[PDB]
Structures are given as structure tokens and as C-alpha cells.
Amino acid sequence: KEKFTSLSPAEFFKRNPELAGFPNPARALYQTVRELIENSLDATDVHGILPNIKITIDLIDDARQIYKVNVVDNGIGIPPQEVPNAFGRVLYSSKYVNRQTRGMYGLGVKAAVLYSQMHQDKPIEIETSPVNSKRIYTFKLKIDINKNEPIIVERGSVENTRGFHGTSVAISIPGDWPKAKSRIYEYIKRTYIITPYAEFIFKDPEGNVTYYPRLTNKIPKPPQEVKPHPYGVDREEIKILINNLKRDYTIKEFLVNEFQSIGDTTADKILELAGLKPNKKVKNLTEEEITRLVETFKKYEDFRSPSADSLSVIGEDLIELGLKKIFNPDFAASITRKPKAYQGHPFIVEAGVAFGGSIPVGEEPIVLRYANKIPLIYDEKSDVIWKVVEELDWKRYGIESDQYQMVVMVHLCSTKIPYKSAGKESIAEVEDIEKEIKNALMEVARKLKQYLSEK
Amino acid sequence: KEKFTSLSPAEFFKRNPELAGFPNPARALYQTVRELIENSLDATDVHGILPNIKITIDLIDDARQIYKVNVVDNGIGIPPQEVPNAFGRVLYSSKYVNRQTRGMYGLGVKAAVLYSQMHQDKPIEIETSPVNSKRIYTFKLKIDINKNEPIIVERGSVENFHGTSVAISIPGDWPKAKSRIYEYIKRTYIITPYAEFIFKDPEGNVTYYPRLTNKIPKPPQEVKPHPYGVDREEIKILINNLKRDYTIKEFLVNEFQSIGDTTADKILELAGLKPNKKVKNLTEEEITRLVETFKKYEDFRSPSADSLSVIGEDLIELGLKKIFNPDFAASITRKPKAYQGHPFIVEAGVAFGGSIPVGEEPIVLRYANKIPLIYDEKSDVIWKVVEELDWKRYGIESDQYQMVVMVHLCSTKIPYKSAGKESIAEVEDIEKEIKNALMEVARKLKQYLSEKRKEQEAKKK
Ligand SMILES: Nc1ncnc2c1ncn2[C@@H]1O[C@H](COP(=O)(O)OP(=O)(O)NP(=O)(O)O)[C@@H](O)[C@H]1O
Ligand SMILES: Nc1ncnc2c1ncn2[C@@H]1O[C@H](COP(=O)(O)OP(=O)(O)NP(=O)(O)O)[C@@H](O)[C@H]1O
Ligand SMILES: [Mg+2]
Numbered sequence A: 001k002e003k004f005t006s007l008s009p010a011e012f013f014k015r016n017p018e019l020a021g022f023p024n025p026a027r028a029l030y031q032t033v034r035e036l037i038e039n040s041l042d043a044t045d046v047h048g049i050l051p052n053i054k055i056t057i058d059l060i061d062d063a064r065q066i067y068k069v070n071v072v073d074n075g076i077g078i079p080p081q082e083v084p085n086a087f088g089r090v091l092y093s094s095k096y097v098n099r100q101t102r103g104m105y106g107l108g109v110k111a112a113v114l115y116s117q118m119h120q121d122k123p124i125e126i127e128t129s130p131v132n133s134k135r136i137y138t139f140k141l142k143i144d145i146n147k148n149e150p151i152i153v154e155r156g157s158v159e160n161t162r163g164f165h166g167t168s169v170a171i172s173i174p175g176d177w178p179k180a181k182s183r184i185y186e187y188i189k190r191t192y193i194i195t196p197y198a199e200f201i202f203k204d205p206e207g208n209v210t211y212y213p214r215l216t217n218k219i220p221k222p223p224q225e226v227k228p229h230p231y232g233v234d235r236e237e238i239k240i241l242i243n244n245l246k247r248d249y250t251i252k253e254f255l256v257n258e259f260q261s262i263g264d265t266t267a268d269k270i271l272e273l274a275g276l277k278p279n280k281k282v283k284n285l286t287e288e289e290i291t292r293l294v295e296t297f298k299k300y301e302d303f304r305s306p307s308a309d310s311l312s313v314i315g316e317d318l319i320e321l322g323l324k325k326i327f328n329p330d331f332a333a334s335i336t337r338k339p340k341a342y343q344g345h346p347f348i349v350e351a352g353v354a355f356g357g358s359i360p361v362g363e364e365p366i367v368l369r370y371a372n373k374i375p376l377i378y379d380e381k382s383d384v385i386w387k388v389v390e391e392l393d394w395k396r397y398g399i400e401s402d403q404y405q406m407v408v409m410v411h412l413c414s415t416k417i418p419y420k421s422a423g424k425e426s427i428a429e430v431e432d433i434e435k436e437i438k439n440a441l442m443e444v445a446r447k448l449k450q451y452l453s454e455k
Numbered sequence B: 001k002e003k004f005t006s007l008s009p010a011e012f013f014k015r016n017p018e019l020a021g022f023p024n025p026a027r028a029l030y031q032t033v034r035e036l037i038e039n040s041l042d043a044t045d046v047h048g049i050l051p052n053i054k055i056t057i058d059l060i061d062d063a064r065q066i067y068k069v070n071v072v073d074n075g076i077g078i079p080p081q082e083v084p085n086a087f088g089r090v091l092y093s094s095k096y097v098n099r100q101t102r103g104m105y106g107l108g109v110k111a112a113v114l115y116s117q118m119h120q121d122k123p124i125e126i127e128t129s130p131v132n133s134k135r136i137y138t139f140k141l142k143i144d145i146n147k148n149e150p151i152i153v154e155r156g157s158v159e160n161f162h163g164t165s166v167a168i169s170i171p172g173d174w175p176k177a178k179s180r181i182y183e184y185i186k187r188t189y190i191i192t193p194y195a196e197f198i199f200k201d202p203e204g205n206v207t208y209y210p211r212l213t214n215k216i217p218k219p220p221q222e223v224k225p226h227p228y229g230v231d232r233e234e235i236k237i238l239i240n241n242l243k244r245d246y247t248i249k250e251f252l253v254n255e256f257q258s259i260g261d262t263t264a265d266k267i268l269e270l271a272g273l274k275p276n277k278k279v280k281n282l283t284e285e286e287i288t289r290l291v292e293t294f295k296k297y298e299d300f301r302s303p304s305a306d307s308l309s310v311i312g313e314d315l316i317e318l319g320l321k322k323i324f325n326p327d328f329a330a331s332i333t334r335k336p337k338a339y340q341g342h343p344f345i346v347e348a349g350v351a352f353g354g355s356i357p358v359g360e361e362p363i364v365l366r367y368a369n370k371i372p373l374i375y376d377e378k379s380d381v382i383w384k385v386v387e388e389l390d391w392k393r394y395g396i397e398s399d400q401y402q403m404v405v406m407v408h409l410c411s412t413k414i415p416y417k418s419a420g421k422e423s424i425a426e427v428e429d430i431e432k433e434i435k436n437a438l439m440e441v442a443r444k445l446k447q448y449l450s451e452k453r454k455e456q457e458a459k460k461k
């Protein structure tokens, strides 16, 4: 007889740790270092703070291969009343708002905690001091998986009285440093290369210490929360926006105030194409009317593109500097495209190419993938970036031999990167995105085409 | 200004449909068919029913490219009170119990429903009649994303026939998904000869796959965990569900497979536990000790093979010859192992020569719990194992050979890299055993290649 039952989000991720990037101990250690750094980076640069990040991994029990991972930053900290949920409630996040951040699911650190609890008994350690008080708060936490609720083991505060803002997070998990070493090193290195306004220090399990000096005090304009762009907004997104209304807006008012690129004239144009009326209440839209708005948004040709205030790019200058410094080529070029939209979300594709000097000779190009400023390291052959690069024909951008020295770099940034898995290692096959990645690559391929014709 | 918010699982997957295999209309159309057929096969063969499944896909709007997908089966049906939750609440399932089934997440049809609701008007329609039912129950439902609970829009009953019909309308891309949907159906048919399928596609083509045998494999059942790899939280769950107030010793022999009286005694001393202490009092620290012992113990018996459902060496070689028409084929059905407390078996087969096209790499056919895997092969651990093996060592000569390699992984839990279930993650115990299985069947290929040459050498000399 079939027995029907329900799972809490925590039970789900605990039954299937692989879903979140925790298939084996090696990937687990890498994933944990990743999640913590991306969390400190979001707590600092998204708020205009020059990042100061400390990463340490120590071997604590050699027989059971448990490593302690500690990441300390100078970010904004977390309000005391939010700490148990932030670190101990699966699907809880300050990044569900429409804004470009490394994080997006409200899961990563909880996934690390769940994996921690299933293999050892030490609670995760959190010390934080938000941008204000005289207090530093310490917490020790466990997740109650059946209920998906935090359990506060330890809780305390002291007086700091200095000017210490930031967060320290320490998790203990099974790991395999030998198997994770190179990837962990590459991850931090590829992050450093595109984050010159940040300082990092990394001490590995064997005591090797690496310092990555800040090179500039110039911090890019922090991304902000923005309204969705109408193009691609779906039926359920629309009704979620409707229910979250605190008045009884008309359709026209709803259009002009809830979306980017819609002003009076666009709104009127939208209404006519959609066969709706300016002054009706949006709360009374039928299921079918909603369908009409959505299709009308898809087929509308005159939408002003999304602002850039929601996005934060690396920039043509830095991408270039970066390629030259790592590969020392004869030629390098890059492009930062104008903002587009897919499924309501603004995005930008940037691309870079490098073709000479110290670049190894190969049959295929070296592909460097980035997403929302995160270096992608695993599963390259599953990524759309790889698919598009593969599909490009270089025999007509200059590369004559079937053997060449090229480095291709693609960065995708959006208020939503569509990963193939919650472990965030590869980008899914989304049409508007493949299309715009191909457009970015072609811009740089042409810049190369000229060179190879010039040289 | 950080603002903290929580999300329900429905809103989670609605925001990231990609995570469940709905990245684009083509993949969406393919994923809906697959999820429906898999639910239908789980509803029939797992219950000793010879599956009779009819699949239709109709275009209902050329402009908007909306397709209606209908899968009809003669399975056990669904108790009416469970329908709303079964189709309308994310993380609701009858397959969380420890048993080999195609389904495992409690998410499959809900992902298609969310996708369907984001893009189109018509609610999912479910008609079902449970076993020993004089009524056929019909529902039309939606999901309340924000709350993650079903919304019943229509519900009715009529007088008396058993099984279920599910119909869902979604955006699709027939011309891009076509060849993959056909391959999915044909590949499942070949390893499922006790099933009968009818498939009608959006162009009006009809394909009939007749039942070739009335013999059905013995249904997989719910079993006890095997101790190797059971984790701390799973121990806590087992302890929490106990009806009797067992001692630790009684806990070990009664809750696990492969643990008898002596094995228990051996395990308790290895872990510093008193046989007679009540389990309900185990301390966090003792749970760590137990788990670590389980993980280190080298004398555990193999999991019951009776707990899984295998394709079998005959069907594998049989299906391989049928499809490729090679000169040679071999397969091995390996003995059960265990990973993270779950029983598993790897089956492997190899076919060489004949109609197999020539290439530089082997053709790689993956299946998991009897489901053919068709996307993301290069992200799969099977693909990884196959690419690491030096085939030059099992007889292959040139850089362009005619070879098909087939790997089947079955278990109470398949560790997929994504809720879309298209590739299997890098789990070590699994990666190691697939290697070993491949090697076993590769030895066989060696024997064939060097029995062929010695024949080519006799004729020449
Ligand atoms: N170092 C930190 N400083 C300040 N806030 C933090 C820090 N780490 C985590 N948080 C807060 O805790 C929340 C949960 O983290 P997390 O579980 O990793 O989810 P997420 O980062 O929001 N998204 P994702 O990582 O993609 O699953 C974040 O949204 C932050 O608001
Ligand atoms: N055709 C069917 N016949 C009988 N029961 C069904 C059928 N379709 C769905 N169910 C039931 O509904 C539940 C939910 O289905 P589903 O949402 O697909 O999740 P799942 O099949 O359990 N696992 P997964 O598909 O991997 O997410 C199943 O577990 C079955 O109990
Ligand atoms: Mg995070």
C-alpha cells in the first residue's frame, strides 16, 4: 500500500545533499568555502564596503577527516534576531529581492549545516556585530530538520566598543583537502583577479598562508533592488505582485508603478494591445485577462531597456587587465553589452578573448566562466557558455589551424542567474541568454578577426 | 537595508524552474511526458500490474505553441482525498519510503504544474479510479504558489475500470524535443517488455509498442537501511520512529539489514556502547561514534539483492542486439553494494561491431532505476568513468571503433545532480563500482576481440 507523506525543505535537502553541491566530501569542502566567501562578499561590496576577508581551513580530526572552515569578513553583520533563521532555516534569505547578488536561494549555508550535522556533532559558530551597537553576538546553532527551524544552542554577547563590524562563521564537516586543493585555490584566485578592491588572506589545512593584496580603493557602484522588467514576466509573477498590493490600484497604475520601462504612453499602448482598461481594478483580473497581459508583454516591441542600477559588471578594463596578467597574450579584447531582460530579469553578458604569448597550444579554447562575479569551476561541459563557445566557428574569425592558443571568457550577470543545480556550478539552457552570449562572443571574435588579419 | 524573507517550496521552484528540468519549452515538453510516464510505471509495475500506458500530445494553440499532454494508465489509481496534495503540494509523495521507484522527490508532476501555471490558463485535470472502486473521480486543480497548497477548481465523481489519466497543458517546442521523446519511449520500451505503450504525437503519428511477455519482474519492496553509510540524522529518525523501547543491541539487529547478534556485539564494542542501554537515550556524541563505526566496519554482509529491481543480463544483451545488431554483446548483473545506507546494483553491458556506427568514442547509454537518461551526459559519473578507462587495454586497436556501452544504476536512492533527474552525481562508492562493472564486461570484450584476431591470423598464415 502506498503511504503518502510530506517533507519540510530541510528534510528534502538532507535526503538529497547532492542537489545542493554536497555529493562527496571533496566537493563538500569546496562548496562550503565557496558559500561562506560568497556570503562575506555579498555582505560587503553590495553595501559599499571594501571587503576584508579571512579564510581558514584546519584539519581537526584526522581519522574521521573533519575539517573546520572559518570565514571572517568586515561586512554589515546580521541583526541578532535574524541569526537563527539566516543560518538555521532552509529557504530564508535577504536576497529574494530583485537585485544582483552572488546568493539567491536562501539555502547555501544551511546546506553546509545539514551536511555538517549528518556527519559530526559540533554546532556551527557565528559571531556578528552589525553596523551599529556596542555588542558582538555569538551563536551556536543546529537545524531541527523535521520542523525546519533553528535550535539555539549557545547565545551570548559582549561589549566590543571599538568599531568592529562583520561576521565570523565556522562550520565543521567531512572533507578531502588533497582532492579539493587545486579547485579551492583556483576559486579564490579567479575571485581575486576580478575583485581588486578586496583583500583576502587564506590559510590552508597544511598551514600555507596566502595573501591577496587590495590593489585599488575604488568600489563599483553597489547593485540595488529594482522593479521587474515587463518582458517575460509570467502569470504567477503578475498575481504575486497583485496580492502584494496595499491599495486597490487600477490596471494602468499597476503597470506604471510595478514595472521598469512603463510610463503613461507605454501603459496606454499596453492596455490596448491587451484589450484591458486603464481604470479597472487590477485585483479583479481574470485568469484569462492575466494571460492577455503576459502575452502582450512578450510581443511588445518598444520597451526601453532595463537600467544598469540593478547589475554590477566587471568591466572591459578589468576583464582585459585580468586576461593579460594571467596569460600574457599577444592580443586581448573585451566587451560589456548593454542590459537585456529575460523572464522579467535584467541581465548583461560581458566577454573577453585572449589569443597569444604564453597561452598553451590546444585543439579547443580555454573557457573561463563567471556568473554574478562568481568563478565557475565544475561541470563546464554542461554549461550553456560552453555550448555556445563550442558552436562558434573560429575558422572564420581568423583561427586557421585546428590548433590554436585562445582564452575565451564569459561573464553573465543578472538579478537571477538560472543555474542547473542549487550547487551553482553551471548555467542552464535559457534561450534569451544563449542568444545574448552568442552576441557577446561574436563582438569579441570580430575584434580578434581584425587582429589576426592585421598581424 | 537587508530584508529577510522565507519562501515555500512551491515558490522556490516557481522562481527557479530550471532546477527541476524546465529551463526551456523544449526541455519542458520532454520533462512533462517523462514525469507522467514514470508516475504511470510506478503506479503499475511496482504493484504487480502489467502496464498499459497511452501517451498523447496535442497542439491546442499553434500561435502560443501550447500543447496538451495526456498520459493514461491502468495503474492503482489515487485515493481521492490524496489527489489534491499528490498533484498540488510540492514535497508530497508516496515514495519517500526506502524502496526502488522511479520517483523520489515528491516534486515531478508539481514542477510541470508550476510551469503550466506560469504560462497558461487551464488547470491540470486528473481522472482516477483506485483499486476496488465503484467511482471514477475527476479533479481540476491549481497550486497556490505562495502557500504551497492545492486549489481545487473542479471536482466530481461518476459511477464506474482502474487507473489514472492526467492531462496538463504547457508551452512546448515539439520539433526540438521530438527525437528525444521518441528515444525516451523506445528506450524504456526495450527494457520493459511486459509493458504496452501507445504514443500519439502532435502530428497525428501513432506508434504502438506491444507487450512481448506476460512475465513481470518481482515488485521492489520497502526495506531496512543497510548500516554502511547511515548518517547521524538518519539514526535520529530511526530512533524517533521506534514503537518499542529497544536496547541499543535490539536497535542494531532489528532496524538494519545485515546485522545479526554477533555483528551487533562486534559493533557495540567497536563503538564503546553498552548493549543494554536504551537507544532512546543515545547521546549526540554516541550517535557520531556509531555512525563512524558503521562507516569503518569491514565485515558487513551484502545488502539483500531481493530489495531492488534489475533489468537482468538477458534483457540487456537482448535489447542491445535488437537496437544495434552488433557482432558481439555482453553484460553483467553485479552483486549488491551499499552507499550511504542505500542498497544499489550496477548493471553493465557492451556491444561491438556490426551496425554500430564508427566513431572515436563509445556510444554511452545510461539508465537509472529503469529510466533511460538522455540529457546532460557529460555531467554524468557514468560518462566520467567511461572516459577514464583506457579501452586500448581491453582489446580495442584504432582511434575509431564500433562500440556501445550500457550502464544501469538501480537503488533505493539515485543520487541525481538535479531535481530534473538527467545525470547521476559523483558518489564515490558508486563511481568505484561502475568502474568495476565496466571492467567486468570489458574483460568479456577482450576475450571476443582476441578470439577474432587469432581467427584472422589463422587464415592469413
Ligand atoms: N557573512 C555574512 N554577513 C552578513 N549576512 C550574512 C552573512 N552570511 C549570511 N548572511 C545572511 O544569511 C542569509 C542566508 O545565507 P544563505 O543560506 O547562504 O542564503 P543566501 O546567501 O541568501 N542565498 P544562497 O547562498 O544562494 O542559497 C543571507 O541571505 C544573508 O542575509
Ligand atoms: N498515474 C499515477 N498513478 C498513481 N499515483 C500517482 C500517479 N501520478 C502520481 N501519483 C502519486 O502522486 C505522487 C506525487 O507524484 P510526483 O509529484 O511525481 O512525485 P513523485 O513521483 O513521488 N517523485 P518525483 O517525481 O521524483 O518528484 C506520487 O508519489 C504518487 O503516489
Ligand atoms: Mg549564500
Ligand SMILES: [Mg+2]
Pocket: B035, B038, B039, B103, B104, B107, B108, B109
Ligand atoms: Mg513522479
